[PDB]
């Protein structure tokens, strides 16, 4: 064996490049030596099954990953249950053991993702990794236990983990109050923090100005901040110009800033943004995704280009007058690689032509709800940006219909890697790897293969999100043409037993997809439940290895394994607010 003749360090080096989880698992089964090579070089693990069981606890000393940096415990069984909680003295003894075993298997964790139902989970795990742990992601879709003190959920992390730099509460439901008290009362931990995602499971009315102020003030070392904010000027505690300038002076190191308003003029003026960008020279990544409008925004965009030369990724919602060709506004930001524009009501073809010349480095372009842009605008842009433009998003633009939009993007059909469109019905896509499709309820998929998108030789993932006749089907079977289509997100959560007819409408013909490997399915809502016809149709997907339903099934989960020949990864993941038991 020429591979096994190599010095062991080099076999390890080979294995360090193999990122596919299944391939790693097969390599480990090859020989005892590659087993050693795989275990010693695996960088990340998402833990499958129940670590409480003796089956995990009494695994070999060989089940060890000395170089594992990212451990994901958030997906352990049963999904979303308390892990290592305390809610008598007998239980702390068994919790200590389970924790110590995880430390044994994974001694070097620097990035942890966990389902944190209450602080005691973190209090149990963290002592074992407190010296090494730099990033912590919290996951909780269940309601915040009402009996907890403010900031109790983050208490164990800010006390113990002296290496902590990154905190990812994007999918962690708690109250904004919890985040404020915690981050304002642990200065020794909080002054070190560089990354902060405060999404709070997207179930918050946004952070208020008197909440954003003290968090930023307590974190002088922030470089990335992602946060929902209350931008609504009907309320006096909303994030305005003052909250922005304070954010910039409190965090003068911010390179990535992504603020969005949870779905009239905003309390944010152009002059306040000029002042804001003036204080943030090292800004590379800027998102302001608002429901309320920022009017005549071009001068602030020019100030952005002037004051923040590093600016690469721009996403703006409800910004008006971002570019008008009488180079103007956004078209002066030559450094841009990514431009996304939601609800720009005065963005014209002339604007896209001006963005085409000005923003030469653009690889990702997006317009959402810009109702003055035509096929001509898109045609010119896709043509001008041909050497670079690889990702396109066109959503809910009134004058832009799917058929003419796909023809407009033809200048780059052979180059485009990622597409996102909403379907509206009034040659090879050579590089198209990823597709996102948005539908109205009762709208057909079938005419998509006629409107363009006939052949997609490298398309491996499709995403379908929905925002009616007796025998008509949505027509997933029309994706059987796409030869390497393996992953699918079918999101019907916002589409609407009574639901059995809608589930059947959408899911019918899913069996046709010969090469479907991974399926993420979201059933329609009113405790979201799959109906039997939906179960019957997903059963017929013989190609499935991974199946994740978001909601529940009273139909035995064991039926799926006995149906689907090669199903391995299967879970019901109620990853929405608020989760049941």
């Amino acid at each position: 064996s020429a591979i096994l003749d190599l010095p062991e360090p080099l076999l390890l080096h080979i294995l360090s490049f193999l990122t596919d989880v299944r391939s790693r698992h097969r390599a480990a089964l090859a020989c005892g030596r590659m087993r050693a090579a795989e275990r010693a070089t695996r960088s990340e693990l998402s833990l499958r099954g129940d670590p409480r069981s003796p089956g995990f606890l009494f695994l070999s000393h060989a089940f060890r990953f000395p170089a594992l940096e990212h451990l994901d415990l958030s997906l352990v069984s049963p999904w979303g249950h308390p892990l290592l909680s305390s809610v008598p003295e007998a239980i702390s003894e068994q919790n200590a053991f389970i924790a110590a075993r995880l430390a044994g298997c994974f001694p070097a964790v620097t990035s942890l993702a966990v389902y944190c139902r209450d602080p005691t989970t973190l209090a149990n795990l963290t002592p074992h990794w407190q010296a090494s742990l730099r990033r912590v992601k919290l996951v909780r879709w269940h309601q915040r236990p009402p009996t907890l003190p403010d900031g109790a959920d983050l208490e164990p992390l800010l006390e113990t983990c002296a290496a902590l730099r990154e905190l990812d509460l994007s999918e962690f439901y708690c109250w904004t109050e919890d985040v404020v008290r915690a981050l304002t009362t642990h200065p020794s931990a909080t002054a070190a923090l560089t990354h902060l995602d405060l999404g709070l499971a997207a179930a918050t009315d946004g952070f208020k100005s008197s909440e954003l102020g003290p968090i930023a003030a307590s974190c002088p070392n922030l470089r990335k901040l992602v946060a929902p904010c209350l931008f609504n000027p009907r309320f006096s505690d909303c994030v305005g110009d003052d909250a922005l300038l304070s954010l910039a002076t409190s965090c003068p190191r911010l390179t990535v800033l992504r603020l969005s308003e949870p779905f009239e003029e905003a309390a944010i003026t152009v002059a306040g943004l000029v002042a804001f960008f003036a204080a943030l020279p090292a800004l590379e990544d800027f998102t302001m995704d608002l429901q309320h409008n920022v009017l005549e925004a071009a001068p602030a965009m020019e100030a952005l280009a002037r004051r923040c030369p590093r600016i690469k990724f721009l996403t703006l919602g409800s910004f008006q007058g971002l570019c008008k060709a009488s180079l103007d506004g956004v078209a002066v930001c030559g450094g841009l690689e990514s431009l996304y524009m939601k609800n720009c009501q005065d963005l014209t073809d002339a604007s896209l032509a001006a963005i085409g010349r000005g923003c030469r480095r653009l690889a990702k372009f997006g317009i959402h709800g810009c109702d003055l842009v035509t096929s001509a605008g898109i045609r010119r842009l896709a043509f001008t940006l041909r050497p670079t433009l690889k990702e396109v998003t066109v959503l809910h633009c009134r004058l832009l219909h799917t058929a003419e939009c796909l023809t407009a993007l033809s200048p780059i059909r052979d180059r485009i890697e990622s597409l996102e469109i909403n379907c509206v019905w009034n040659g090879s896509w050579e590089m198209l790897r990823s597709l996102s499709l948005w539908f109205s309820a009762g709208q057909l998929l079938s005419p998509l293969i006629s409107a363009g998108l006939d052949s997609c030789p490298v398309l491996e993932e499709i995403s379908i999100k929905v925002e009616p006749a007796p025998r008509t089907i949505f027509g997933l079977s029309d994706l059987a043409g796409f030869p390497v289509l393996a992953k699918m997100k079918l999101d019907l959560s916002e589409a609407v037993m009574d639901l059995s007819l809608w589930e059947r409408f959408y899911l019918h013909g899913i069996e046709s997809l010969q090469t479907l490997y991974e399926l993420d399915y979201w059933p329609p809502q009113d405790h979201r439940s799959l109906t039997l016809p939906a179960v019957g149709l997903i059963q017929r997907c013989v190609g499935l290895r991974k199946l994740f339903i978001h909601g529940t099934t009273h139909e035995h989960f064991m039926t799926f394994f006995l149906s689907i020949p090669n199903l391995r990864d299967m879970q019901l993941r109620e990853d929405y607010y608020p989760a049941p038991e």
Partner: protein, 106 residues
């Protein structure tokens, strides 16, 4: 040749271990795509050994990356046949590995 500084085992020298077949290809690499890796298996592993010995980090990264893709998407039996590996496990210690793997999501 000049190009020599890409080998750390030369920048530290301010080669009786590598044959001319491999040294010429090491040299032809350092003229500074992946069609250079259209090489056979025997000389690929000789190129890995040379890249490490000569301490060319860039060459070593690419050559080992090629071997990773060679393992990727292959069943255990197919990995064994690709690299002429003898199956070193007892039925008991193989089902140990197979059981261990089930604790990680694919």
């Amino acid at each position: 040749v000049e190009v020599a500084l890409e080998s750390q085992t030369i920048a530290h020298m301010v080669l009786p271990n590598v044959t001319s077949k491999i040294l010429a290809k090491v040299i032809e690499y350092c003229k500074r795509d992946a069609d250079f890796m259209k090489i056979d298996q025997a000389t690929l592993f000789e190129l890995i050994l040379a890249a490490n010995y000569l301490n060319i980090k860039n060459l070593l990264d690419l050559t080992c990356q090629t071997v990773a893709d060679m393992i990727k998407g292959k069943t255990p039996e197919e990995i064994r046949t690709t690299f002429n590996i003898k199956n070193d496990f007892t039925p008991e210690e193989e089902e140990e590995v197979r059981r261990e793997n089930q604790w990680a999501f694919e």
